[PDB]
Each structure stands twice: as C-alpha cells, then as structure tokens.
C-alpha cells in the first residue's frame, strides 16, 4: 502492499539513483551513486536528501536548470513495500518491485557532519 517505493535514475551533475520510500504522506529520499543492488552481498552508499511530495513518484521527464533536482528523471523501478522496522539510525523494509524484491536495509553510519547510510539487500 500500500505505501509505495520509487527508484528514479537522476541524470544531474553526475548520474545517480534516487531511492524513495513513502512515509507519513511524503517520500523520504536518498541519493545512491550506483544502481540499487538487486542481490544481497553488495553494499551501497545512500545519502539522505530532502523529502519529495508523493506525486513525484510518478514523475519522468526533465527538471529545468536552477531548480532543486535539476536534470533528467526516469523511473527505474516502482512498487510497494512493507515496513519491518524504523528507528532514527535504521530502516528495514520488504520491497515489492520489478528490479528490487525482498528485504532491504538502511543503516545510518555513526561516523563523521551529516551522516550517510549503508544500503543493502538482506542475505535472507
Ligand atoms: Cl555506492
Ligand atoms: Mn537526485
């Protein structure tokens, strides 16, 4: 399922992937510099970005220069998810997409400034 998740390939300064989870009516968002991992074993960096409105889960097209989020946007994956766990430094979700299926984990590093998240698919 009911809440949704979206992955948008964002062609901006660099090519990266925005990973978004519907929480509390908005899309909590992370920039991932590589494709979200389809299989366990691989860890990605995920950088928290600003919330996006829910309707953004449907957006595919180009954001004009000078805007936050400027660049080319394409839907890479889309689905629903079940939230298994959520705490200040940890999020565990079961994803139901076409590329991403199964349990995924976000853990906010305690190290360092604003702190990034370790992003991976559970070995399950
Ligand atoms: Cl990475
Ligand atoms: Mn982005």
Class from helix and strand fractions: mainly beta
Strand order of the largest sheet: 1-2-3-4-10-9-8-7
> Main beta sheet, described?
8 strands, antiparallel, barrel
Question: What's the helix count?
Answer: 0
- Please give the radius of gyration in angstroms: 14 Å
- Taken in chain order, the helices and strands follow as EEEEEEEEEE
Each distinct ligand: chloride ion, manganese (II) ion
- The gross shape turns out to be globular
| Helix content percent band | under 10%
Domain count: 1
The proportion of strand residues reads: over 45%
Work out the number of β strands.
Answer: 10
Tell me the span between the first and last alpha carbons: 20 Å
Domain DNA ligase D 3'-phosphoesterase: 8-108
Keywords: Metal-binding
GO molecular function: metal ion binding
Organism: Methanosarcina barkeri (strain Fusaro / DSM 804)
Q: What's the SSE blueprint?
A:
Blueprint: E1 4-11, E2 15-23, E3 26-32, E4 43-48, E5 52-53, E6 61-63, E7 71-87, E8 90-96, E9 101-108, E10 117-121
Antiparallel strand pairs: 1-2, 1-7, 2-3, 3-4, 3-5, 4-10, 6-7, 7-8, 8-9, 9-10
Bound molecules: chloride ion and manganese (II) ion.
Domain DNA ligase D 3'-phosphoesterase: 8-108
Keywords: Metal-binding
Binding site for Mn(2+): 10, 16, 18
What is the gist of this entry?
The PDB classes it as hydrolase. The protein has one domain (1-124). It is mainly beta.
Characterise the protein shown here.
Residues 8-108 form the DNA ligase D 3'-phosphoesterase domain. It comes from Methanosarcina barkeri (strain Fusaro / DSM 804). This is DNA ligase D 3'-phosphoesterase domain-containing protein. By secondary structure, the protein is mainly beta. The chain is 0% helix and 58% strand. It has one domain (1-124). The chain is built from no helices and 10 strands. The protein has an 8-stranded antiparallel β-barrel. The protein is globular. It starts with a strand and ends with a strand.
């Amino acid at each position: 399922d009911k809440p949704i998740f979206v992955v948008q390939r964002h062609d901006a300064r660099k090519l990266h992937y925005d990973f978004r989870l519907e929480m509390d009516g908005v899309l909590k968002s992370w920039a991932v510099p590589k494709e979200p991992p389809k299989d366990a074993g691989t860890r990605r960096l995920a950088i928290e970005t600003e919330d996006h409105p829910l309707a953004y889960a449907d957006f595919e097209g180009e954001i004009p220069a000078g805007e936050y989020g400027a660049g080319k946007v394409e839907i890479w994956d889309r689905g629903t998810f079940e939230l298994l766990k959520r705490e200040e430094r940890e999020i565990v979700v079961s994803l139901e997409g076409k590329e991403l299926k199964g349990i995924y984990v976000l853990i906010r590093t305690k190290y360092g400034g604003e702190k990034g998240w370790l992003f991976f698919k559970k070995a399950s």
